[PDB]
Amino acid sequence: KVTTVVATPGQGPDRPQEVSYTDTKVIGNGSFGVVYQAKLCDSGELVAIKKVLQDKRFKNRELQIMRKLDHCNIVRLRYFFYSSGEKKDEVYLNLVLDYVPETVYRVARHYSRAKQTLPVIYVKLYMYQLFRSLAYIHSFGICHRDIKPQNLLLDPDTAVLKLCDFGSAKQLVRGEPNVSYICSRYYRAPELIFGATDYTSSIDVWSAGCVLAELLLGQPIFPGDSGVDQLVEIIKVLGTPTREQIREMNPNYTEFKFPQIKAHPWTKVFRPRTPPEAIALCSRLLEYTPTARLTPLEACAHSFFDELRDPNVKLPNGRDTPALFNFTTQELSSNPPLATILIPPHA
Numbered sequence: 542k543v544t545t546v547v548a549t550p551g552q553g554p555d556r557p558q559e560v561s562y563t564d565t566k567v568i569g570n571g572s573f574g575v576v577y578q579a580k581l582c583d584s585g586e587l588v589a590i591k592k593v594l595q596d597k598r599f600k601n602r603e604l605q606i607m608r609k610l611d612h613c614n615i616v617r618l619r620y621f622f623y624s625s626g627e628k629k630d631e632v633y634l635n636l637v638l639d640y641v642p643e644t645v646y647r648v649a650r651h652y653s654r655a656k657q658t659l660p661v662i663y664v665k666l667y668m669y670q671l672f673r674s675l676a677y678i679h680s681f682g683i684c685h686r687d688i689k690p691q692n693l694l695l696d697p698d699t700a701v702l703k704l705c706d707f708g709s710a711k712q713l714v715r716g717e718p719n720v721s722y723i724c725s726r727y728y729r730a731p732e733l734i735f736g737a738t739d740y741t742s743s744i745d746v747w748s749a750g751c752v753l754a755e756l757l758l759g760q761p762i763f764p765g766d767s768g769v770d771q772l773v774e775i776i777k778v779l780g781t782p783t784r785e786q787i788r789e790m791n792p793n794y795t796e797f798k799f800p801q802i803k804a805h806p807w808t809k810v811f812r813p814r815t816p817p818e819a820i821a822l823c824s825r826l827l828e829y830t831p832t833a834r835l836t837p838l839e840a841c842a843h844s845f846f847d848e849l850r851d852p853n854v855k856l857p858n859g860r861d862t863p864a865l866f867n868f869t870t871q872e873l874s875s876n877p878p879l880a881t882i883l884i885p886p887h888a
């Protein structure tokens with residue numbers, strides 16, 4: 542019932558520390574390993590414990606990356622420790638992380654299954670915090686490579702969003718190739734489908750655009766049945782990519798031949814009452830040419846998020862909005878002048 546381990550703190554002084562926890566239960570199992578909920582005996586706080594078999598055959602920088610990160614929109618790593626487990630001669634890594642009760646996937650599904658869509662204030666708040674989280678990691682050159690609603694945790698009372706699951710993440714280095722079959726299919730950037738190994742952090746921006754469109758639509762905008770059919774789904778919205786767009790995606794595939802299909806108007810992709818600013822923003826994320834997509838910090842600055850910078854904005858439940866403007870130098874480093882838009886005069 543009470544488990545006591547000696548664990549290393551996620552950040553700060555390296556000295557190991559005795560940690561006890563109880564009330565453990567499984568909250569999810571899959572390709573990511575097993576994630577448990579538990580309660581810290583010391584403080585009584587709920588935590589998540591992610592348990593991952595250490596398998597040389599599968600690359601994984603999750604611990605390395607998480608020990609470096611400290612941001613209000615990224616799930617915090619509290620401790621880590623090694624243990625035995627199911628495979629009775631191998632070693633498991635255990636990550637003790639913050640517990641966050643909901644996910645964007647479940648909250649969106651709640652409306653979608655009732656033939657509603659997520660109220661617009663929450664689309665603004667969640668998308669904005671996701672772009673903040675992306676601006677933060679991209680400033681270290683770290684690409685998440687698995688942005689999707691299942692990996693976005695939410696506190697429904699405070700509207701705080703926290704990015705999680707860095708099992709696919711990697712520090713991208715110019716000139717060093719990266720694997721092309723990456724990202725969950727529906728959220729996979731087209732340059733990855735075209736087999737690019739020299740891609741950049743903008744593949745996360747495409748995935749974020751897929752999340753935004755999905756929150757506006759009530760279902761994935763690009764529900765491909767296969768790695769290849771994923772491209773067909775994209776084309777049936779954006780139209781057939783031109784030769785130059787393919788050259789921007791992967792120079793080695795420009796001779797690609799596909800039937801000529803014209804784009805579907807953005808204003809007809811979404812239902813009539815969709816806020817035009819959200820459509821506008823979506824059109825600048827879901828672009829074939831990877832360098833044409835907005836950067837996360839540019840996205841934060843988009844007019845779609847102006848309501849969040851209003852001094853009188855409030856959560857529907859009457860509470861104040863969460864922290865939105867406590868930008869750091871590291872966070873603003875891609876475009877420091879942008880602070881004058883991102884940080885409103887009242888903050």
Ligand SMILES: CN(c1ncnc2[nH]c3cc(Cl)ccc3c12)[C@H]1CCCN(CCC#N)C1
Pocket residue numbers: 568569570573576588589591616638639640641642643644691692694705706707
């Ligand atoms: C719902 N949820 C969680 N629910 C409450 N708190 C949590 N903290 C976390 C810290 C981390 Cl890094 C990861 C997950 C959680 C998490 C998981 C369930 C298992 C799947 N996973 C996403 C894939 C991975 N990996 C979401």
